[PDB]
Amino acid sequence: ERMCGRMSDFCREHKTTLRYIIWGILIAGYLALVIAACVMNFHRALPLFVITVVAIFFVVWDHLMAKYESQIARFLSPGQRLLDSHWFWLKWVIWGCLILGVILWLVFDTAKLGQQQLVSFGGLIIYTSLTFLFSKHPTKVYWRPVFWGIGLQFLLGLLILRTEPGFMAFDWLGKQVQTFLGYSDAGASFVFGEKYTDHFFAFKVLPIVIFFSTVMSMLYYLGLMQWIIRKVGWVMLVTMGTSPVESVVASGNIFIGQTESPLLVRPYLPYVTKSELHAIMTAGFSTIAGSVLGAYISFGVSSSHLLTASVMSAPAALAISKLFWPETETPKDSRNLLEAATQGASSSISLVANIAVNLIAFLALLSFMNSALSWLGNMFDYPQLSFEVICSYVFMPFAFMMGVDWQDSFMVAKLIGYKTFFNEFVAYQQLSKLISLRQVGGPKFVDGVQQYMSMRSEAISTYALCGFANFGSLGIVIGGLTSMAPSRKRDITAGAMRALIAGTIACFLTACIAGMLTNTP
Amino acid sequence: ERMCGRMSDFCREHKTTLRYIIWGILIAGYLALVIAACVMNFHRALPLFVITVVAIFFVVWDHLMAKYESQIARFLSPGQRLLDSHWFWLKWVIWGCLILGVILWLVFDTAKLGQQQLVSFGGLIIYTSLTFLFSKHPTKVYWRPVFWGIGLQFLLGLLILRTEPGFMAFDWLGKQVQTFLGYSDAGASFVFGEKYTDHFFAFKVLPIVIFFSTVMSMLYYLGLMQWIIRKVGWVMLVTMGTSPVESVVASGNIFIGQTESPLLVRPYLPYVTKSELHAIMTAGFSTIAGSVLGAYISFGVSSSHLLTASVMSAPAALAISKLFWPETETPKINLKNAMKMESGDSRNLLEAATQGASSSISLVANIAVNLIAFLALLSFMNSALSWLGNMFDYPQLSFEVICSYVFMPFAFMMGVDWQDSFMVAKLIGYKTFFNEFVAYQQLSKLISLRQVGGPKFVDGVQQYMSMRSEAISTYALCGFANFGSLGIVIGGLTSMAPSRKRDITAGAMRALIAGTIACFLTACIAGMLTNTP
Amino acid sequence: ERMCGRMSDFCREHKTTLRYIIWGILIAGYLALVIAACVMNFHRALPLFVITVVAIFFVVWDHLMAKYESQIARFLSPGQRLLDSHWFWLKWVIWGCLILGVILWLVFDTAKLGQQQLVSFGGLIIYTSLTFLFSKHPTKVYWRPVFWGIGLQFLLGLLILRTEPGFMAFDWLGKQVQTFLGYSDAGASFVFGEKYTDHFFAFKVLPIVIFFSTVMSMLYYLGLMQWIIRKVGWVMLVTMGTSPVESVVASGNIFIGQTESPLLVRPYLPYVTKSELHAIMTAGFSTIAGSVLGAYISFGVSSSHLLTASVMSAPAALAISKLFWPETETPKINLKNAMKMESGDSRNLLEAATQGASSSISLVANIAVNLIAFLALLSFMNSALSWLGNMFDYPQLSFEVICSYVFMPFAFMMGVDWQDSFMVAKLIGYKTFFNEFVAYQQLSKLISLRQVGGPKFVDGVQQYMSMRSEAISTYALCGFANFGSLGIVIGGLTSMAPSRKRDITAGAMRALIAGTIACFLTACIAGMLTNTP
Numbered sequence A: 001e002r003m004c005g006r007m008s009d010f011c012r013e014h015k016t017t018l019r020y021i022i023w024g025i026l027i028a029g030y031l032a033l034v035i036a037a038c039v040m041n042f043h044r045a046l047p048l049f050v051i052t053v054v055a056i057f058f059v060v061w062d063h064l065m066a067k068y069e070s071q072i073a074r075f076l077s078p079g080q081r082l083l084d085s086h087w088f089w090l091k092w093v094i095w096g097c098l099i100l101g102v103i104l105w106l107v108f109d110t111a112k113l114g115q116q117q118l119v120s121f122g123g124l125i126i127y128t129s130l131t132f133l134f135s136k137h138p139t140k141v142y143w144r145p146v147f148w149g150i151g152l153q154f155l156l157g158l159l160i161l162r163t164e165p166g167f168m169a170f171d172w173l174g175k176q177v178q179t180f181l182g183y184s185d186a187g188a189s190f191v192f193g194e195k196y197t198d199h200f201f202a203f204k205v206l207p208i209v210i211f212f213s214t215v216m217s218m219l220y221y222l223g224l225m226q227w228i229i230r231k232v233g234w235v236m237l238v239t240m241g242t243s244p245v246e247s248v249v250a251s252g253n254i255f256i257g258q259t260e261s262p263l264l265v266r267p268y269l270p271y272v273t274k275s276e277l278h279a280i281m282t283a284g285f286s287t288i289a290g291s292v293l294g295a296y297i298s299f300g301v302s303s304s305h306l307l308t309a310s311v312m313s314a315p316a317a318l319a320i321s322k323l324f325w326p327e328t329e330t331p332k333d334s335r336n337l338l339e340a341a342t343q344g345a346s347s348s349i350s351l352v353a354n355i356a357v358n359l360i361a362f363l364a365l366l367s368f369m370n371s372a373l374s375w376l377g378n379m380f381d382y383p384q385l386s387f388e389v390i391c392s393y394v395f396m397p398f399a400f401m402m403g404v405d406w407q408d409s410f411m412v413a414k415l416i417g418y419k420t421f422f423n424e425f426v427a428y429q430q431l432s433k434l435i436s437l438r439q440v441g442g443p444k445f446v447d448g449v450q451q452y453m454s455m456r457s458e459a460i461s462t463y464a465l466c467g468f469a470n471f472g473s474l475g476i477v478i479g480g481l482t483s484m485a486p487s488r489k490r491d492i493t494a495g496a497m498r499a500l501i502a503g504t505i506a507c508f509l510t511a512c513i514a515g516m517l518t519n520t521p
Numbered sequence B, C: 001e002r003m004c005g006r007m008s009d010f011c012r013e014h015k016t017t018l019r020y021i022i023w024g025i026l027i028a029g030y031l032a033l034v035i036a037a038c039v040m041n042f043h044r045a046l047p048l049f050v051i052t053v054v055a056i057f058f059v060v061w062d063h064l065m066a067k068y069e070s071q072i073a074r075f076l077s078p079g080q081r082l083l084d085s086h087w088f089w090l091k092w093v094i095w096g097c098l099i100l101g102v103i104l105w106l107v108f109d110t111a112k113l114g115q116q117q118l119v120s121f122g123g124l125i126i127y128t129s130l131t132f133l134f135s136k137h138p139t140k141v142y143w144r145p146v147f148w149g150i151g152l153q154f155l156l157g158l159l160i161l162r163t164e165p166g167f168m169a170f171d172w173l174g175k176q177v178q179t180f181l182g183y184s185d186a187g188a189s190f191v192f193g194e195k196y197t198d199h200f201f202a203f204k205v206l207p208i209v210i211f212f213s214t215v216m217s218m219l220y221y222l223g224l225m226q227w228i229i230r231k232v233g234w235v236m237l238v239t240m241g242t243s244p245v246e247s248v249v250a251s252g253n254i255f256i257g258q259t260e261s262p263l264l265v266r267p268y269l270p271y272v273t274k275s276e277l278h279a280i281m282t283a284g285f286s287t288i289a290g291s292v293l294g295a296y297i298s299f300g301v302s303s304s305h306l307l308t309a310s311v312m313s314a315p316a317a318l319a320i321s322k323l324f325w326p327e328t329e330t331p332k333i334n335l336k337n338a339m340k341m342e343s344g345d346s347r348n349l350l351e352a353a354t355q356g357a358s359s360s361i362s363l364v365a366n367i368a369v370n371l372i373a374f375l376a377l378l379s380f381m382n383s384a385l386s387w388l389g390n391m392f393d394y395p396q397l398s399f400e401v402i403c404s405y406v407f408m409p410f411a412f413m414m415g416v417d418w419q420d421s422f423m424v425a426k427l428i429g430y431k432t433f434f435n436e437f438v439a440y441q442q443l444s445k446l447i448s449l450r451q452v453g454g455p456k457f458v459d460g461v462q463q464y465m466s467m468r469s470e471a472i473s474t475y476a477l478c479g480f481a482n483f484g485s486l487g488i489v490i491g492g493l494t495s496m497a498p499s500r501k502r503d504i505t506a507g508a509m510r511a512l513i514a515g516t517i518a519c520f521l522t523a524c525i526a527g528m529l530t531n532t533p
């Protein structure tokens, strides 16, 4: 094999140039594919052209910023110095302008809609105050994230509710995510037989976790996910104090489940601070997944309201995490692709078992609590006593503060009780039943039991229920997070209940703002 | 800012008094609620009133006993001194009186009942004698634990089986255990859908283990379980005279599985002697766990007999271990060290729940895989036996036919009559080679056949057996001693104390036989007390 | 006490005689049973008489070989010496005669069979040359194991395929294995209910794995599989001349999986050379286990071809390993040490069964989860490919429409005709990227389509392929070489021998390619001997 050795030496002589040539050949082939697709039919080939243009623009921008960083920094430094010099009096001007804008908005927009929106605004203020009062570290609170989150959720709500173009983009993104999950559905269909839909959770919801684990492992190996995390971290750090990890988690949870989303930042989980872990859990508890979203738009719940609530939850989750548990402490392996995929698979084999077992145990305990309450009520002539009715009676003032008129406070409180102590699936079933009763028509009160509730109360209830804040969710979150990062086990269980409460309050805040904006048609 | 800090400091200054007052106010409010419930309608509120009275009495009793232990010991000392002084001649009188009482009770009661009761008593004597003969150190035997264990079993059986209020009380306790464990379906149905019943075993029976493990972890963290364990262990320690560590483990094994029982004394596990380790393994084998009790009651097995079997099996295991592998060396664990139990790592409730749930994972996985393998082996064995027996004009030959003749003498000695001893032998064989779940399934089928009625002999094959034989079989099957389950238990124990690995395997096989003999002793006593239909 | 010790000592003195008497009595009883069965009805007792006769013959043969090995070696030595003396000129004559015989066979048989068989032989030559070229050490290649492996494969294929009694024997064995695993399929109904057929894969295919693992551990404890492995390994070692460890491993994979086969030489894994480690990996990747044999035969795959491929894969595996990665260092493992296989440490048979059952859990879990992930990725890939192809007015583009063209040359060289090479190419692609289960499923569907009948071409798409192509595809797919399994093998083997980790990851992909080439060689040899329908 003298010839083989000579050829190997020759290739090694021009190894870099050979690699550059082959990569250039592949790039030329991809560009030829794009150009041919455009030639045959441009409208048909438009998405591939747009994707290619965005990718090439990002590559060029990154290279240019890396090369010309010195000149850009030197040019920008004087502006930063000037801003630092004049901040002392400029902060007052900015705050005054913002207060003036809020006053104008209340005067011209909300006052015209009706009196019920001012109550929504009052509720918003009350909720913020209460969250600050019971915060873990009241003194060490950073108010910039909170105000930015409230303002951002307000703007996004106004961008999705008032304008159709804003609606279209988020609809498109949701469709893409659901289409993505359909693939794990197909794999599970093969492995568990065609009758896998008989056992929905066990044979459908967990294969999603397996597939997402696999893909995320591969994407961390390739290096795209770290680029995404860097870009998101930078933009969010300029716009808010939020750190990159929790910002990315919160953005991901908009369309991804609570159990899947922490896999976005799995490598960083051991080294996150307590506040960032609390923010991760809270962001998980205050959003719903994609498949459930499809099933809820199927039941008859409005699609626009579900989408608006899902999008608005993330800023609200971040603001409530930063207020409820501020950050006092200072922050802070795959040889090839097949290794990435296989390691993802194995991590999944651990995760799924832990999740399932914890969920079983927690639901059993909750049912026992409810049955002991029913027994105690039976001894008092009121066997109907349970968690749901205690919430139907306790939650009425909060429901009224959210904006729903007094008459409909009871039904909204009961729905929130079902949602908190039973998955929001049953809560949305009840809500759709009430919507159907209203649409069919009939007497408002049969004898003394109300049948349905106004349209506006239905919208508020739709906003309030959009979240995975239950105790089964508590179980699956604890199990999954302890499987992902065993080192932080003692820390994960510490902030679980506060995370759950923060998630529920985030849902209530989104509902408060939505009621501030929406009006009965 | 500063005001909040000042308020926090002021609260901390009076933190103890304020917290005590608030907790007392909450307790008083609960008491007022109970009082109001009783006033409104006493009959409905009777359970809550009884629970409150019992809890108050036990709290007061524990507090007083802690307060005046020295005075109690001082008052007791003169009596102990006098008894020690006069024991030299009083021991013979006590022994003679005990022998006379035994003879009188045996003659009158048993001879009135029939011959099967006398046969069961003879079987008890035979089992004890055989255990004594095949003992590790027959010369170095200490008979006091043996006699006291047999006496405690007899007293428990006489108090439950022969007294109606006790029978009703234990039946009620079993019903409550079943009802409590039935709540696992709330989670099983959610996780596995409403069709979870379609796969009965996998999506009903296994989740019960998960729920029980979580509940026991929570109770161990809180400290309710340790209270009962300490009390029963103290009773056994004072009566029989066993060592504190083995007494605590045997008392715990009543309602805790064999795998999780030694975790109570894990910190001191390396320092146990050989005899104590053998007793630990035996007490683990002889008794069943609390999780399986609900499932077995569901099949139709009597709850009173299950509960009585567990309670009587604890002292059975201890006495048989002391007779079978007597201790020949000085123990190294103090009573205070043994009794004290400290949570491994549970700062808050959620951590305890999560830890129990996580352990149930491996438990259930091993259980299911072993079941699959061993039932496949059973089917193959039956087919091969039938094929071999077809050669000799006997195609009915199977595993059951061999087992019925093999184990017949044990069933006959336990007190079962001649004709029914073969079916009990079949059950014993199923339990010995395969875990007791399948044996209990077969027993439930026989019980259902009896209850439904019909011909006792269809053509020439008996369909069901008497009620007394069913009670005896219930007692003789209440254990975890299996050939298949040996390996796992060894591994589990070896995980807790690797330093003792060489010792654990040495006494692993003999503990299984000791546990089976203990089960047979409990069954012998039950057969003696029960009366023929 | 003293009498008991004296009796124990006396029994210890005669312990060996007691064991010998017990074994003699058992043997006499078995012989008496066989005699009774034969005399009652020789027709019914034929199978048991045959089993007894073969068992006695093998026992006698083993005893004679063990006792008189020295005399046999003494007698054989002069002949070997004379052969070595004349070898200098005899080797040319033997080689020329062998080549002449090969040419005569080709001309007389293969040309008459048709052109496709000549193409199959050409493909055999092409595969051998291609493997030689891209070899780790082309200059240092030992050519004896290559020619001897090809010769043994040809001899075995000729014997089984071209002789009817041999063809019937392997069919009979396949049916017996079907029945043996059907026992497990029945035994899983208890755990997963009577509706386990609803979820075919998870609740039928995996219990087969568990039961096979249990049976394998049982047999390993007894010592039969070790006997068979020793005999086959000796047959291959006397001919080829490979090393002891690699011969034993490649001779014990015919029925053992890849993950568990190295346990045979687990103690010596850290001392194996790089070449022998590669041979172990290759023999792992080029054979299937016996657990999956039943399922594949049930789908409709021919049993004779499955068993013939399993048997032929081992010589091909070794020949390809020795061609691809020839040995350049002296092994340090003795033949006596390698052939020795330590029996299971299990105290009894049932402990071994439990150990195997507990071991199977990780294998089943990894299989399931890898299947889920990889099929999800396949669905995503197909969707993206169709989306891209829609832009060029070709939405039919997909993963299989690329595999058909990518792997076509390999199928064509194997001897398949032009028209049917694309379907075999799709099957090869499915087996390479995803496990052979899915490829065999597609093959079963095509065989069912052929058997049912109907139009050969319903449209411009072919429906089913010829019979000979089905046999060739049966041979080519009989392996465990997957991208998905490339990880698990490494993970297990590093667990067995951590010190060798750096070496294991070096020779994994080459081992996988060697396994695939071994499968293709078996397919070529099979296709050269199969006449067109």
Ligand SMILES: CC(C)C(=O)OC[C@H]1O[C@@H](n2ccc(NO)nc2=O)[C@H](O)[C@@H]1O
Binding pocket: A200, A201, A205, A257, A258, A259, A289, A290, A291, A292, A423, A424, A425, A468, A470, A472, A473, A476, B190
């Ligand atoms: C029970 C099924 C049918 C259901 O949909 O009820 C909603 C509840 O099921 C959990 N859940 C659901 C979907 C998901 N990703 O798509 N992750 C989850 O955790 C979550 O607890 C929620 O409350």
Ligand SMILES: CC(C)C(=O)OC[C@H]1O[C@@H](n2ccc(NO)nc2=O)[C@H](O)[C@@H]1O
Binding pocket: B205, B206, B209, B212, B256, B257, B258, B259, B289, B290, B291, B292, B295, B367, B435, B436, B437, B480, B482, B485
């Ligand atoms: C499916 C279950 C109910 C069953 O059939 O049980 C048979 C085997 O399960 C072991 N087991 C069970 C429960 C437990 N704690 O609740 N500890 C144990 O060890 C025990 O060894 C026995 O042999």
Ligand SMILES: CC(C)C(=O)OC[C@H]1O[C@@H](n2ccc(NO)nc2=O)[C@H](O)[C@@H]1O
Binding pocket: C205, C206, C209, C212, C256, C257, C258, C259, C289, C290, C291, C292, C367, C435, C436, C437, C480, C481, C482, C485
């Ligand atoms: C569903 C099962 C039966 C199956 O089709 O298996 C596919 C993959 O599972 C690996 N496997 C399988 C069996 C075994 N011993 O019986 N050892 C293994 O490693 C092996 O990689 C193969 O590709």
